[PDB]
Amino acid sequence: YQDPERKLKILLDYSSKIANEKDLRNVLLFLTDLAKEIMEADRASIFLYDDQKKTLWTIVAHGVDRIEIDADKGIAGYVFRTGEILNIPDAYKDPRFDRDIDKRTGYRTRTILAVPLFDRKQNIIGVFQVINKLTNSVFTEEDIELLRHISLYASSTIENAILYEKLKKAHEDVIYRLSHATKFKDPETQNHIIRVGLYAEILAREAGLDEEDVELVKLAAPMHDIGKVGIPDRVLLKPGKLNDEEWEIMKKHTIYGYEILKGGDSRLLQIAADIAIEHHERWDGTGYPFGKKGEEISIYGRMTSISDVFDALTSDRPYKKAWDMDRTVRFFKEQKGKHFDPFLTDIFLKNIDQMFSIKRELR
Amino acid sequence: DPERKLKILLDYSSKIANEKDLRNVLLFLTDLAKEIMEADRASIFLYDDQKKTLWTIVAHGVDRIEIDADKGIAGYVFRTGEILNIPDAYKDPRFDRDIDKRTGYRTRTILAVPLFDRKQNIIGVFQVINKLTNSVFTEEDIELLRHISLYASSTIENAILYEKLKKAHEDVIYRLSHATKFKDPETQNHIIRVGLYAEILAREAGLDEEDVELVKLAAPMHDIGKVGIPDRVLLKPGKLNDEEWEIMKKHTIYGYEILKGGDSRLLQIAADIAIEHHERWDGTGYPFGKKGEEISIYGRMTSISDVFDALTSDRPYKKAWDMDRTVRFFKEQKGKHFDPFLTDIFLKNIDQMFSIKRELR
Ligand SMILES: [Fe+3]
Ligand SMILES: [Fe+3]
Ligand SMILES: [Fe+3]
Ligand SMILES: [Fe+3]
Ligand SMILES: [Fe+3]
Ligand SMILES: [Fe+3]
């Protein structure tokens, strides 16, 4: 006997999967699978409009490229332009249908149902199409209604995924740019600030941290030197090496960074503040500003020390050429359990190729 | 016709996917569940690590209601992770009939299931009440509610993630904007309030809600370029001479240089505000003497909000101006310092500005 709630439970499962999925590619796949099962259709496609190239596009299969579609032509094109629904009982009798794809593969397209996708402001942003009704000779008025509800859900999900990626990007950008507010008085580069978080992301990941903490270290580590904004110019701009009085002030960039960052409530800022105050501490207990030792330094500060020293060593600094991989490796092995956490150093060494790769393509 | 509940689900999940507010997500989910389970009432209880209680919200948008995490039906399900299916609440010893008493309600059937996060921990309880057959929730109803519960878990975890990100993003922008705090007196609350005034101004001038959210977050960064000003200028313990003042004026250009290496709309706007905020509608400002609409609307809105905040704060010998005095100054400056059209909008809403100033001292 059949389950009367079968499709309902199937739809709820798809909706759970989709709500969890941040990648637009897979959202599109899951929406397509959903349509096929709910519409009882053999094939389904989503076409979205590209502002720049002036084309609709679709992904044909799992993992394959964007196929551009002519928005001025065909069935999807009609629906995209007019906002009207096309329900084709026989594709081979509609001059808007192209048989070439059909001609090559042994596939026979019979029925086509295409509806527009609308954004929140009722603009047409694409088309949702289904092909070859399996359990009836034609798509019905009821099928049209159902596909329109699916379209609304698809629209919302697609926009949400895009809005979220826009936010994610803006958040990174802001952290990167503001972290480099020191650019006028300190020579550390914008790419340095980015790369340090990227190396620390690998370390946290390979060290087995939760995906949330991996993401936080990537964004928190770049802020470690923000405290330099409060250092006097006579110290920060001194064209050589510091006296005791001056060095003592320079060290306070850690304390200052902490003061700038600690007033947050977010985990991001609590971790960033700790990194700011910890990143010159040594596994030894011989670092600054407090001589914290071993596990007294949060794992985030320990990961940032390794990443930051790595990136400095692999850049040219006046009087000293950037070190190559081999020397950097020997250095880290020698400083294991001294400057750096011995467990994290091993992880870092084991992933040293990914480190140099980031360094090479982000100059 | 069995497609009825599918169209209902699809309507609710569309609204859920748009919703940025946890409270509203929860209301949608409970309305979804009432319709799909054909039950009269539903509730979602979530756990607060801090207070060690469950909580729930009721409709109309009232306060969070604290619920005892140990005793009760919800309490039982949260602690044990077991499903609870009650045919008659008034015969169950764990039922608290006081909710019925105050509301005029008579609870009959209760079905309550756990909500789990991805990590697999129990984070709450989904409860459905008064199946509309006036009879028991069935094994098939339990099974349906297990699927609804997984969908609720996912959308709730997603909405919480989204709120964490938004809050972290604001925190970052606010804290780093105040990185000037060792060397400049502009306060943390000032930096926040200026975006909040510009947010009301943008809304009331009819910008898209996305742009309104952008101005709230972009305006706060407009003085970041002060970090590039030499100490012999910024910390000079005497009035600046003309040459030093020309250097000080470059904090606009410096802010632009810090911010402009973006691709995001937020940074593109923030960079414009950094470079424009001392420009004057009549073209007599700095650094470039831009005039009227040559100044982006975002820069024009920030100049109004930043001056407002400064007129309404006390300094030694210089008492904050009151509403009447501030209004008069803005009318005088219409078409001079400020965009006449925006000033009108700002003046129509000045009570909202004073309320912000009073709420965040
Ligand atoms: Fe450094
Ligand atoms: Fe440092
Ligand atoms: Fe560094
Ligand atoms: Fe200022
Ligand atoms: Fe300024
Ligand atoms: Fe200001």
Residue numbers in the entry:
A (entry chain B): -2 to 360
B (entry chain A): 0 to 360
From the paper:
Here we describe the first crystal structure of an enzymatically active HD‐GYP phosphodiesterase protein, PmGH from Persephonella marina EX‐H1, a thermophilic marine member of the Aquificales. PmGH comprises an HD‐GYP domain fused to a GAF domain. A remarkable feature of the structure of PmGH was the identification of a trinuclear Fe centre which is buried at the bottom of the cavity forming the c‐di‐GMP binding site.
The structure was solved by the single wavelength anomalous diffraction (SAD) technique using the anomalous signal from the bound iron. Anomalous diffraction difference maps showed all three metal sites to be occupied by iron atoms, with anomalous peak heights in excess of 40 σ separated by approximately 3.5 Å. The bond valence sum method was used to estimate the oxidation states of the three Fe ions which assigned the two peripheral sites as occupied by Fe(II) and the middle site by Fe(III). The tri‐iron centre delineates the floor of the open chela with the two peripheral metal sites being in close proximity to Y285 of the GYP motif on one side (the G‐site) and H221 of the HD motif on the other side (the H‐site). The middle iron binding site (M‐site) is sandwiched between the G‐ and H‐sites with Fe‐Fe bond distances of 3.40 Å and 3.67 Å respectively. All three metals are octahedrally co‐ordinated. In PmGH the HD‐GYP domain conserved residues E185, H189, H221, D222, H250, H276, H277 and D305 contribute to ligand binding with the metal co‐ordination sphere completed by succinate and imidazole bound from the crystallization buffer as well as two solvent molecules which bridge the G‐M and M‐H metal pairs. Both pairs of Fe sites, G‐M and M‐H, are triply bridged: the G‐M pair by the carboxylate groups of D222 and a succinate from the crystallization buffer in a bidentate fashion and by a monodentate bridged solvent molecule; whereas the M‐H pair is bidentately co‐ordinated by the carboxylate groups of E185 and a second succinate ion and by another monodentate bridged solvent molecule. Analysis of metal‐ligand bond lengths for the bridging solvent molecules is consistent with the bridging ligand being a hydroxide ion. PmGH presents an accessible and far larger binding cavity than is the case for Bd1817 where the active site is capped by a ‘lid’ formed by loops corresponding to L7/8 and L10/11 in PmGH.
